[PDB]
Design a protein around this ligand. Sequence first.
Ligand SMILES: [Mg+2]
Lengths: 95, 208, 51, 49, 124, 100, 50, 151, 249
Amino acid sequence: ATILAEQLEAFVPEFDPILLRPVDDLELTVRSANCLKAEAIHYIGDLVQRTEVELLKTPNLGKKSLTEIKDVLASRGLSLGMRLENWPPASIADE
Amino acid sequence: EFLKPRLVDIEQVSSTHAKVTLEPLERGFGHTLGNALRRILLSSMPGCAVTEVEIDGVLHEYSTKEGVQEDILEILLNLKGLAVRVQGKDEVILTLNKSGIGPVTAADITHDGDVEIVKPQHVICHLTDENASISMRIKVQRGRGYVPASTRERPIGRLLVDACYSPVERIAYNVEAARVEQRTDLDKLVIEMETNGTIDPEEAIRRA
Amino acid sequence: VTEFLKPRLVDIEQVSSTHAKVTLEPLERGFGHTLGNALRRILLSSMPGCA
Amino acid sequence: VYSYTEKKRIRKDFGKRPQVLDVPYLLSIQLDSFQKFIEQDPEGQYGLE
Amino acid sequence: MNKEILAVVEAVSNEKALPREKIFEALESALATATKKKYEQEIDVRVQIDRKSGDFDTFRRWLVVDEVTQPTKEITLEAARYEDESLNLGDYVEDQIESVTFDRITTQTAKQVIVQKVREAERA
Amino acid sequence: KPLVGTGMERAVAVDSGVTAVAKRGGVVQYVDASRIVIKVNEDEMYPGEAGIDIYNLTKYTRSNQNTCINQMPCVSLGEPVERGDVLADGPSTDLGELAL
Amino acid sequence: EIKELLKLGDLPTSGQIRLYDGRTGEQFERPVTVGYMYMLKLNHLVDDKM
Amino acid sequence: SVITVGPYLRLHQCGLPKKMALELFKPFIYGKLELRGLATTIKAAKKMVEREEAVVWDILDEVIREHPVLLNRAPTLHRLGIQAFEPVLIEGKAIQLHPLVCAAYNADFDGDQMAVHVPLTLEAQLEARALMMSTNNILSPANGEPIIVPS
Amino acid sequence: GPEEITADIPNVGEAALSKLDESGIVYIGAEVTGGDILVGKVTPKGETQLTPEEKLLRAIFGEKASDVKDSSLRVPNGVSGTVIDVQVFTRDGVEKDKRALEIEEMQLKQAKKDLSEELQILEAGLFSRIRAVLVAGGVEAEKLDKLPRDRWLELGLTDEEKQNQLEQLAEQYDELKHEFEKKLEAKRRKITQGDDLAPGVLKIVKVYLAVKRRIQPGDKMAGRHGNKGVISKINPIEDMPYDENGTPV
Ligand SMILES: [Mg+2]
């Protein structure tokens, strides 16, 4: 083994890309998606800035649709009421 | 005082296979290191093959998709033969989208920042209508040897292919007489490997 | 991926004198032959000595 | 001349005796007998007739 | 059906010398736990059994909090006050949900919880 | 395929009923794993009943011995086919031959 | 004719190639017959009889 | 099951698959599992071997040891067509049968099948080891000629 | 009484019923093991007593005593597979459950699409014939595709073989229209109707498992000359005798 081993010693802030997605990609109920669009919430980054108390003021948004939005945001590691500094980025302000 | 082997010449005669060369060697060690490194290179080398496929409108692997002239099973075999290099990950998920009449080659995969296809002319399937499109997710991971599907899927939409994590195909050594050194009764070990492009040859002989 | 079953000499049943029987385990589904063949070919000739 | 699927992969053929009668339709016993059975033909000739 | 709840409560009360109230509280907790297991999400559930009919209503409940960490069990004070202006931090908002059908699964859970309460009170 | 056959494979494959033999020759219009559409040539064609043939292949279904009697399309698109010719290989066939 | 077709390829005339061993890595004496045979799987499997 | 060769074995032992071994030795495994104390009631043991956990294979290599089995070719003509072996467990689904013993069974390997039988009681284990073991049948009873002749 | 195919069953943990839908029949595509449940059928019923808590089922659920016993027809082991095709046949009069209506809508949709594609494909061939005829004899190179395609007959062309052929193709086209109407009505009748079955059976569920058996020591291979054999050892690649090129046998 010593001979065979001696014959081998010559070898050996960046915005998270999820915030830039539309709210329709969240697989929300047709009711929840249409209620969010009526309040001009287009992106996930817009939704995440709104508080639970603000979303409950939206016309036709029920307690059930609010729970759906929380469960879906939680499945992506997001929570309601996060403050994003410099949102929306200038790349979105022109659509 | 045995003479020690040192790599001398790596003749990359084609893109797949090369001919590494060991020099010098005392008599008897030619066949010993040749058979030993052949058996290690064929046995266990780290390859980068594929594990899971999820075609979009396909429930089980025995179905047929509207607008592609091969079955889903033949698409799984053609993806099983995919020759792909990964660089800085354990596993990785590649994405494929293609629409229009003609082949779906292996260069139509949206490549990530480290995955590198080594043979982009590889056909997978043939789309055969103007609005009939496949859109699949491919899962490519590291491994060692041959890990079939029966040993190792939670939704009904995943499809498990067998996993041949093995980069080399054919390892042939040919011992021959040495004349570079004035001293006679020395040997040269010339190993022609046969890689599929996913493994550098000096890296292969170093890992072996 | 570079982690194999590192083996060891579980016993040296040296039968009588000037004769041993050394068993090694565990090896891969193919490394018993390559270590047996490597050690067999080296001991046969490479190993030096006087006579 | 060859048919177009015989220009895909034309099989090499040894063999010396030039053929004169090709292989007939191999299922002619079943089909010809049952066509003889059920076929509108009287004079007490067809199976049912 | 209805009169059968009363007959079971009376039989168990007389045989085990146990307060009917303690048996119902435990059946409510048993049914709430059986309900929680039918949902994929961790919900909070209250069950209330009517002491005369044996009928039972199942409520999903949310705890009123300032900051929601568990959207399946917690609601903001602003959202709770949209439904009832009288609610404070620490109160519960309740929605009536479909009561679990009393299959042999709930039946087995109810039996286990009854046997546990019988043992707890025999021990006392 | 058999590398060493007897040339009798095409009689056993075509003269059985596992392959999809073309009835009227012509030009293929649409190949799919489910169906195959032949456009019939004009020198083989009826005056009425305008006519382009549709072959509905038999996909994965049970045989009597619990095997898998499949049919795979073996023609390309835009390809000419002649009368009396294989379009879809069957079980244990290849290009109209017999590969057991 | 088989000999003349084995001469068209650069194969040996007698059909027999010398073959090495996989375990020992040393040559089998008296060169052996290799080729291609067309082999069939029969449906007498072993996880239907066991 | 179907037989196959396995030439590493000695004439006294034969290969026997793990799936057949866990099915034929269910009561011995139940008794062994109840002795250790891993489970309590019999049901628990039947769930354990229905699931085939990681601990029943050591139990199986405990009961197979020193317990012969009767291998039997289906047309048994003379007494050398029932011989008792010791099992060696096989990853596989085919009985590995020592080759010399094949000339006793008239068993080639062209699709042949053999039956295994388990001597349950203790006198039957001793009869399998002391009368019917394959080392004990090395001469054919019809004459004096050896039946373990190399084929 | 009759049997139940529904998944409303006690005893079975969610670990069994996760691979069934809301109506007992396994999914199409669910890769099962040896001994799971494909079709749930509460049927073997002898006798089971009711405790006060089991008697309380009468109040909320409504069932008198949940039949008499409780056990769901579960299946045995030995084979894996992937469920590729499920058939449900219903003796006429029996209530179709939700999955039998799903298969009925599915086959209605398939046969609807297939006969509509028969009409579209043969109409495409017919219009290609009209274009092939109108190459000569009053050809309109620009005026041909200004009007809708179903009126390619009243263009400028006298009484010839070509107007006769367009009249024959109009006969064929109206035949295809009324034939498509009556055949789609007959195919809806064939899908919608029940089937005559065994004496005293409600519905038959057939499930097709699709095992993929590879090769192992013990299978039988043979050439074409009588050289049989049980394959005895599946060696690694390295142990094979190779030649002086490199390829293993
Ligand atoms: Mg035999």
